[PDB]
Amino acid sequence: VTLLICAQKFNGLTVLPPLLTDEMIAQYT
Amino acid sequence: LCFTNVYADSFVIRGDEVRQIAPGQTGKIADYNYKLPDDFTGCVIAWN
Amino acid sequence: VSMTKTSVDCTMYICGDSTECSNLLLQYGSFCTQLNRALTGIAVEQDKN
Amino acid sequence: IANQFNSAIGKIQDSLSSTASALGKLQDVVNQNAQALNTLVKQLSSNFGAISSVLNDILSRLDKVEAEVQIDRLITGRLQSLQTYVTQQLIRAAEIR
Amino acid sequence: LDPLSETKCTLKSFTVEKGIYQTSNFRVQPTESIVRFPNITNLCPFGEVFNATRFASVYAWNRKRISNCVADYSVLYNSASFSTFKCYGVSPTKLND
Amino acid sequence: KNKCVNFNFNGLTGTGVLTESNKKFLPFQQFGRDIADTTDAVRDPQTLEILDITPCSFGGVSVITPGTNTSNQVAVLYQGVNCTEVPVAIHADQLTPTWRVYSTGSNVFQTRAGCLIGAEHVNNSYECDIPIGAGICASYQT
Ligand SMILES: *[C@@H]1O[C@H](CO)[C@@H](O[C@@H]2O[C@H](CO)[C@@H](O)[C@H](O)[C@H]2NC(C)=O)[C@H](O)[C@H]1NC(C)=O
Ligand SMILES: *[C@@H]1O[C@H](CO)[C@@H](O[C@@H]2O[C@H](CO)[C@@H](O)[C@H](O)[C@H]2NC(C)=O)[C@H](O)[C@H]1NC(C)=O
Ligand SMILES: *[C@@H]1O[C@H](CO)[C@@H](O)[C@H](O)[C@H]1NC(C)=O
Ligand SMILES: *[C@@H]1O[C@H](CO)[C@@H](O)[C@H](O)[C@H]1NC(C)=O
Ligand SMILES: *[C@@H]1O[C@H](CO)[C@@H](O)[C@H](O)[C@H]1NC(C)=O
Ligand SMILES: *[C@@H]1O[C@H](CO)[C@@H](O)[C@H](O)[C@H]1NC(C)=O
């Protein structure tokens, strides 16, 4: 699974990070 | 209808400049003499 | 389990550096705040999930 | 029972190391989210009946008076563009929940 | 006045509960302004249009190219001689920009 | 170039950061367009030097508080911001936010979530109190 965006930002569209990083998800798992 | 305050602004111009007394206009009467606000409320009355 | 969190500045999307647009957009009331309240509720839920 | 388990976990890797499409349920989510932001950026290019899709082309040309009738069109069409996106995302968030 | 005041003002409450509270997006504003027009040492021959001795009949209306020249439209719009001066996708006052 | 300015090209007045474009614009190509159908580049009419336009730096801002009941002290998170863009944020270049008591720095911590100011970074881990993102939380403590 592989996760434009810059142009979306130039237009007020932003992505926020998840609270648990992929390392914290892997520690729980 | 009632009104909070009322004013009458009185003056003389030429028939050709009467169009400049409307709000949001341009030209030497609207720019150098008498400007109405772009949100004007009131009535413009003119006669020969 | 979750999806991408997004936030959308309703002023910058609708009004591209336009004060006139802003002063016009203010005539719709709470729409922009309601859109950000919705996307924040979706975004908080991605961490709950 | 242990050799079976070890062989069954072996096949799990083989399958994931081989096929391109096994996580199709997760990529879809990424594809849906991206497609909705790319559609929302495309809405900006629409006139909605204004003389241009660009506010700088309206402000530089029409004076405030003539401009507001054009700016309102762009505000009206964009506002819906955002409402559409947020309604699609609120419905789509309930699928993910 | 301060971040906290912007959260009180965004929550519409004079007290704020413990937690993170998104506020207005920040943004650096222009340090100065810039204008970049192709430098033209010649102006446009509007006198050879508006003061030409003979106009064309409407059944065979004339068409003149205006090119590689500066156009001061404030002179054209300031003249009280024109009974009609209507601009349809632009405004005459902002033609100079 | 590399400055927040109100540029104007061929009648096109726009606000953005002009920058020499690395894009190999063909001679005929005047303006440069971004995927968003927006102007990401433009040709200078006088001195031919293709210019990438980029918008001036921005992000969300989020305020972290033990709650007005507990105290008035707060910490500020600048979303998706590297710490070096908060020295860039100066009153000289007035920003939408008129307040700037945080640009005094010394506690500017960098989170993957963004630039966080007024909160003291520590090595101790705790249960998450206020969630900042990318593994970081904040809390009001001695
Ligand atoms: C019962 O089934 C198991 C498999 O579940 C059989 O075990 C396999 O036996 C073959 C040889 O016949 C080996 O090559 C395989 O490695 C064995 N399986 C595993 C995973 O190690 C077993 O033979 C079956 N028993 C009967 C009586 O049929
Ligand atoms: C067309 O001719 C008239 C006069 O023949 C010009 O009008 C003059 O304009 C100047 C300013 O450029 C004024 O100072 C004069 O007072 C005007 N004279 C009169 C009698 O009107 C007009 O400029 C000419 N138009 C063009 C495009 O050359
Ligand atoms: C403007 O003047 C400069 C002077 O060096 C020249 O190089 C440039 O070509 C001129 N602008 C235009 C119209 O190209
Ligand atoms: C905190 O809340 C309590 C009630 O729960 C109230 O009595 C007290 O005055 C508050 N303190 C401050 C400083 O807000
Ligand atoms: C911020 O920029 C500096 C450049 O000196 C870089 O070294 C650092 O990793 C960046 N921090 C983040 C995570 O943005
Ligand atoms: C964290 O530990 C490092 C050494 O690993 C030390 O240099 C640093 O000062 C510590 N920071 C805090 C906040 O205690």
Coordinates of N, CA and C in Angstrom, one line a residue, chain E residues 1-4 6-8 14-39 97, chain F residues 4-11 15 44-46 56-63 65-68 79 81 93-96 99 129-131:
Chain E
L1 N -5.6 38.9 21.0 CA -4.7 39.4 22.0 C -3.6 38.3 22.3
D2 N -4.0 37.1 22.3 CA -3.1 35.9 22.6 C -3.7 34.6 22.1
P3 N -2.9 33.6 21.8 CA -3.5 32.3 21.5 C -4.7 31.9 22.3
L4 N -4.6 31.9 23.6 CA -5.7 31.5 24.5 C -6.9 32.3 24.1
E6 N -7.7 33.6 21.3 CA -8.2 33.1 20.0 C -8.9 31.8 20.2
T7 N -8.6 30.9 21.1 CA -9.4 29.7 21.4 C -10.7 30.1 22.1
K8 N -10.7 30.9 23.1 CA -11.9 31.4 23.8 C -12.9 32.0 22.7
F14 N -16.0 31.8 27.5 CA -15.0 32.6 28.3 C -14.1 31.6 29.1
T15 N -14.5 30.3 29.2 CA -13.7 29.3 29.8 C -13.4 28.2 28.7
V16 N -12.2 27.6 28.8 CA -11.8 26.5 27.9 C -11.4 25.3 28.7
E17 N -12.0 24.1 28.3 CA -11.7 22.8 28.9 C -10.3 22.3 28.5
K18 N -9.7 21.4 29.2 CA -8.3 20.9 28.9 C -8.4 20.1 27.6
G19 N -7.4 20.3 26.7 CA -7.4 19.6 25.4 C -6.7 20.5 24.4
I20 N -6.5 19.9 23.2 CA -5.9 20.7 22.0 C -7.1 21.4 21.3
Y21 N -6.8 22.7 20.9 CA -7.9 23.5 20.2 C -7.4 24.1 19.0
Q22 N -7.8 23.6 17.8 CA -7.4 24.2 16.5 C -7.9 25.7 16.4
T23 N -7.1 26.6 15.9 CA -7.5 28.0 15.8 C -7.4 28.4 14.3
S24 N -7.3 29.7 14.0 CA -7.1 30.2 12.6 C -5.8 29.8 12.1
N25 N -5.7 29.4 10.8 CA -4.4 29.1 10.2 C -3.5 30.3 10.1
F26 N -2.2 30.2 10.5 CA -1.3 31.4 10.3 C -0.8 31.5 8.9
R27 N -0.2 32.6 8.5 CA 0.2 32.8 7.2 C 1.1 34.1 7.0
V28 N 2.3 33.9 6.5 CA 3.2 35.1 6.3 C 2.6 36.0 5.2
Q29 N 2.5 37.3 5.4 CA 1.9 38.2 4.4 C 3.0 39.0 3.6
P30 N 2.7 39.5 2.4 CA 3.7 40.2 1.6 C 4.6 41.2 2.3
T31 N 5.9 41.2 2.0 CA 6.9 42.1 2.5 C 6.9 43.4 1.6
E32 N 6.5 43.2 0.4 CA 6.4 44.4 -0.6 C 5.6 44.0 -1.8
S33 N 5.5 44.8 -2.8 CA 4.7 44.5 -4.0 C 5.6 44.5 -5.3
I34 N 5.3 43.8 -6.3 CA 6.1 43.8 -7.6 C 5.3 43.9 -8.8
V35 N 5.7 44.7 -9.8 CA 5.0 44.8 -11.1 C 6.0 44.4 -12.2
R36 N 5.6 43.6 -13.2 CA 6.5 43.1 -14.3 C 5.8 43.2 -15.6
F37 N 5.9 44.4 -16.3 CA 5.3 44.5 -17.6 C 6.4 44.6 -18.7
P38 N 6.2 44.0 -19.9 CA 7.2 44.2 -21.0 C 7.5 45.7 -21.2
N39 N 8.8 46.1 -21.2 CA 9.1 47.5 -21.3 C 8.8 48.0 -22.7
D97 N -4.1 48.6 -15.4 CA -3.4 47.7 -14.5 C -3.2 46.3 -15.2
Chain F
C4 N 7.9 36.8 0.1 CA 6.5 37.0 0.0 C 6.2 38.3 -0.6
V5 N 5.7 38.4 -1.8 CA 5.5 39.7 -2.5 C 4.2 39.7 -3.3
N6 N 3.7 40.9 -3.6 CA 2.5 41.0 -4.5 C 3.0 41.2 -5.9
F7 N 3.5 40.2 -6.6 CA 4.0 40.3 -8.0 C 2.9 40.6 -9.0
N8 N 3.3 41.2 -10.1 CA 2.3 41.5 -11.2 C 2.9 41.3 -12.5
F9 N 2.4 40.2 -13.2 CA 3.0 39.9 -14.5 C 2.0 40.0 -15.7
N10 N 2.3 40.9 -16.6 CA 1.3 41.1 -17.8 C -0.1 41.4 -17.3
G11 N -0.2 42.2 -16.2 CA -1.6 42.6 -15.7 C -2.1 41.6 -14.7
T15 N -0.2 37.2 -5.2 CA 0.6 37.1 -4.0 C 1.3 35.7 -3.9
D44 N 9.3 36.0 -16.7 CA 9.5 37.5 -16.5 C 9.5 38.2 -17.9
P45 N 8.6 39.2 -18.1 CA 8.5 39.8 -19.4 C 9.8 40.5 -19.9
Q46 N 10.5 41.1 -18.9 CA 11.7 41.9 -19.2 C 12.9 40.9 -19.3
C56 N 3.2 31.9 0.2 CA 4.0 32.3 1.4 C 3.7 31.3 2.5
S57 N 4.6 31.0 3.4 CA 4.4 29.9 4.4 C 3.2 30.1 5.3
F58 N 2.5 29.0 5.6 CA 1.3 29.0 6.4 C 1.2 27.6 7.0
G59 N 0.2 27.4 7.9 CA -0.2 26.2 8.5 C -1.3 26.4 9.5
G60 N -1.9 25.3 10.0 CA -2.8 25.4 11.2 C -2.0 25.8 12.4
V61 N -2.7 26.4 13.4 CA -2.1 26.7 14.7 C -3.1 26.2 15.7
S62 N -2.5 25.5 16.7 CA -3.3 24.8 17.7 C -2.8 25.1 19.1
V63 N -3.7 25.4 20.1 CA -3.3 25.9 21.4 C -3.6 24.8 22.4
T65 N -3.7 23.6 26.4 CA -4.0 24.2 27.6 C -4.4 23.2 28.7
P66 N -4.0 23.3 30.0 CA -4.5 22.4 31.1 C -5.9 22.8 31.3
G67 N -6.5 23.7 30.5 CA -7.8 24.2 30.7 C -7.8 25.5 31.5
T68 N -8.6 26.5 31.2 CA -8.6 27.8 31.9 C -8.7 27.6 33.4
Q79 N 1.2 23.6 13.0 CA 1.0 22.4 12.2 C 1.8 22.3 10.9
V81 N 5.0 22.5 10.5 CA 6.0 23.6 10.4 C 7.3 23.1 11.0
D93 N 6.9 41.5 8.8 CA 6.0 40.9 7.7 C 4.7 40.6 8.5
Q94 N 3.8 41.6 8.8 CA 2.6 41.3 9.6 C 1.9 40.0 9.1
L95 N 1.7 39.1 10.0 CA 0.9 37.8 9.7 C -0.6 38.0 10.1
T96 N -1.5 37.2 9.6 CA -2.9 37.3 10.0 C -2.9 37.4 11.6
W99 N -0.9 38.8 17.4 CA -0.1 38.3 18.6 C 1.2 37.6 18.2
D129 N -2.1 12.9 27.5 CA -3.0 13.8 28.0 C -3.7 14.6 27.0
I130 N -3.1 15.6 26.3 CA -3.5 16.3 25.1 C -2.8 15.8 23.9
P131 N -3.4 15.2 22.8 CA -2.7 14.6 21.7 C -2.3 15.6 20.6

